[PDB]
UniProtKB/Swiss-Prot annotation:
Reaction catalyzed: RNA(n) + a ribonucleoside 5'-triphosphate = RNA(n+1) + diphosphate; a 5'-end diphospho-ribonucleoside in mRNA + GTP + H(+) = a 5'-end (5'-triphosphoguanosine)-ribonucleoside in mRNA + diphosphate
Protein name, as recorded: RNA-directed RNA polymerase nsp12
Subunit structure: Interacts with nsp7 and nsp8 to form the replication-transcription complex (RTC): nsp12, nsp7, two subunits of nsp8, and up to two subunits of nsp13. Interacts with nsp9.
Reported regulation of activity: Inhibited by Remdesivir antiviral drug (GS-5734) through non-obligate RNA chain termination.
Domain NiRAN positions: 5-259
LRR repeat residues: 197-222
Requisite cofactors: Mg(2+)
Chain sites annotated for binding Mn(2+): 207, 216
Role description: RNA-directed RNA polymerase that catalyzes the transcription of viral genomic and subgenomic RNAs. Acts in complex with nsp7 and nsp8 to transcribe both the minus and positive strands of genomic RNA. The kinase-like NiRAN domain of NSP12 attaches one or more nucleotides to the amino terminus of NSP9, forming a covalent RNA-protein intermediate that serves as transcription/replication primer.
Organism from which the protein derives: Severe acute respiratory syndrome coronavirus 2 (2019-nCoV)
Amino acid sequence: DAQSFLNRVCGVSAARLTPCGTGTSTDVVYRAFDIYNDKVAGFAKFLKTNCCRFQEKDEDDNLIDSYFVVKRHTFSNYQHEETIYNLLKDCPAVAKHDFFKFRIDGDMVPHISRQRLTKYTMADLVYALRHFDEGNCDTLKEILVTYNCCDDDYFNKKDWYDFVENPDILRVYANLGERVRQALLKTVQFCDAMRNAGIVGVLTLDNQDLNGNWYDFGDFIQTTPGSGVPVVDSYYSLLMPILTLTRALTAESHVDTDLTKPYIK
Ligand SMILES: Nc1ncnc2c1ncn2[C@@H]1O[C@H](COP(=O)(O)OP(=O)(O)O)[C@@H](O)[C@H]1O
Ligand SMILES: [Mg+2]
């Protein structure tokens, strides 16, 4: 049932969810995968249709930027990703998973539910800032608004994007800095949690939500503990220009690397 499924998704973690889907059905969304496999390669916008998404609403029943993605896939992937998560559970930079098999039509379909992810992923931010198109940029306005970078009336300005006719735009982009820097830090934690847990895999941007949590272990093969290896060639390099467009390291010139402390002399 469309309500029993939602109540199961809520699970132990007490939350109130509004289904962005339609009656326990997959929600088709247009994202910015950074993909490479036998057939397709590149950093493009694909159309993902294997994730039933619910949005959490806090007290006052206001929708907030925290979702419950419920990706459903085959049983072998279910087992493999459950074991990989169990190995990587203890890290703080890993979105809290919840694995459960549910009655849908005629068989127990296994759903793995990522809890409290942001709407977009770091790949979406990188793509929006790297493939800018002034006439069609709705996934950049939404990111800039939902994280209080600007006021949603900044976009009524005639040139809210020009770097030469509106230098103040930089001050807006810099308001993402402390949201990017943290992400970087969390990667260095997640990478460590792999190196210690002996897991070999490729870190792609489209798996890290804007908070920083990493939530996909589909192609993570495991090896002898303590001898894992994260591959971050295509993560730090695609994310590279955003570290100076949004001045991500500007918090390193404050004593104790705190944005409230005074400057280092
Ligand atoms: N055709 C497919 N149908 C359903 N699931 C797939 C398919 N191809 C790959 N997958 C699984 O989905 C993962 C990629 O999905 P993705 O869009 O990244 O969701 P997530 O970001 O939650 O991992 C792969 O690691 C694999 O386990
Ligand atoms: Mg993924």
